[PDB]
Symmetry: C3
Subunit: 209 residues, 3 copies
């Protein structure tokens, strides 16, 4: 492109990662983002994003997930809760792929981050297009033994604008790897990808951390 | 300069484009805003909201002062007269008398070939004194809205360059220094795509409406 | 590193300048702020607003704790005493007892040759634990104000690097790691230009006032 090198990396990073980002609507008969964990149809998001569906339930609460498959085709499916972890603000959902091929994130690591490197936050703000915000890693939080709801252990602080429009979506590094999960239930913060890598396999298999 | 390459680009872009930026004061005999020079005749583009009371209320008192800079670098000010309005797309055109002054028109770019991730530069004139620069990326390219009506932009450019009152109505630029949109604030920040402006402004000038 | 050149400069700038940054707690026997190490003797520069109650209220209980890091990397804390105040330019100087600790003073730069569009880096210590980094550009270079008086900065540096309570009183830096300003928040973000601090701080130290 006739774009600068940095613009080129940004543009490419978005083209290759936004197909992993999903849009989540909490309907009552609350909106958020999430991302594709695997080809089976597991979706990671924030607990706050699906808080009513998981607690109120009451029978009426449903969960619609919109995304894109490997061909580029927008589509939508009912999302079922597989596991919750409100302590780390994590939740896993499962959709039925039904032969659709998904685009899983590429997991990175959060223990070797350095304050000053680029970070990229992607969300799906209104159900239509995905959105990109860019900043740096501003801070690497301290270890919090019992996080309890409103406190992230090892939180990644960033100055990439993070709001409701992209909470639950991935925080990426300059290689396009996912190093965190955007939150907003609480100057912006992500849950480190290392906490998610330790926890998500237990939510899938046991249904709790 | 001993500045990094990126700083150098930013510094030059601002030097070569800020002279196109104007400051707009809605006086009652309140509300301030930015706009930019469209051509050497003295046409100025801004937001409709920026000149809303002057255009709707009128009443008699409402005047319109425009401050800017000529090609020599000399600051100066003039009365601004409404030429056309397009509240649907949040656009307005004003006319000032140059009287032998040479202005610095923007360089129009295009907005249908933008890509999420490229750089954008928002320039305004926030308090009547110096121009201001904010830098971000194109965060989103909005969907088509056939009948925008007031508080909705068709093909809105979303950016994370900080956009406020201090620079509404001023230009959003790309890395070549071309204008690709118009900063709005009436509605996470949004610009009206320069393509909508390129189709609409010639009609505001010639007919006085879209 | 496998980091891009720009990330590399950012990462290094932070590593080499965050040890100069200090955390300031106004304890009543509240209000927190940042500041930075001016010299090896133990002088600390910050905002006046940050230590306002300790300087005006006093009463008796008001104390001032300062946390920082020595040249070996060891975190440590000390009582901080007011040396001089300058509320007109929102400046204050504090002194601590090093008692054989080696400190890390900022490297002073200049603010008169700044250009809108160059990079700037704001650093603070927001909750007493780690230091934070925010990155932007110089957005504006303010006009001269002969009598600033409280809520108005002469030659203010405007930036779009995020500036809040968590880093007020801390340094604003350029791409070389030099300090070009002091973050404020008592008043779109603003820093007090380092040139005003370079003229004023020697008087606060020696005479106790500007
Ligand atoms: Ca290129
Ligand atoms: Ca950059
Ligand atoms: Ca911001
Ligand atoms: Ca250079
Ligand atoms: Ca490298």
């Amino acid at each position: 492109e006739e774009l600068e090198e940095e613009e080129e990396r940004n543009v490419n990073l978005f083209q290759k990662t936004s197909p992993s980002v999903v849009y989540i609507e909490a309907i009552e008969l609350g909106t958020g983002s999430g991302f594709v964990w695997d080809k089976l149809g597991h979706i990671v998001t924030n607990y706050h994003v699906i808080a009513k569906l998981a607690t109120d339930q009451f029978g009426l609460q449903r969960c619609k997930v919109s995304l894109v498959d490997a061909k580029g085709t927008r589509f939508s499916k009912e999302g079922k809760i597989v596991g919750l972890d409100p302590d780390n603000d994590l939740a896993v959902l499962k959709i039925e792929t039904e032969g659709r091929e998904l685009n899983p994130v590429v997991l990175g690591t959060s223990n070797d981050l350095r304050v000053g490197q680029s970070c990229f936050a992607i969300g799906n703000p209104y159900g239509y297009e995905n959105t990109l915000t860019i900043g740096v890693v501003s801070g690497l939080g301290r270890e919090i033994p019992s996080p309890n709801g409103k406190s992230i252990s090892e939180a990644i602080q960033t100055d990439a604008d993070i709001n409701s429009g992209n909470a639950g979506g991935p925080l990426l590094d300059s290689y396009g790897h996912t190093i965190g999960v955007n939150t907003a239930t609480f100057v912006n913060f992500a849950i480190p990808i290392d906490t998610v890598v330790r926890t998500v396999p237990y939510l899938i298999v046991y249904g709790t951390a």
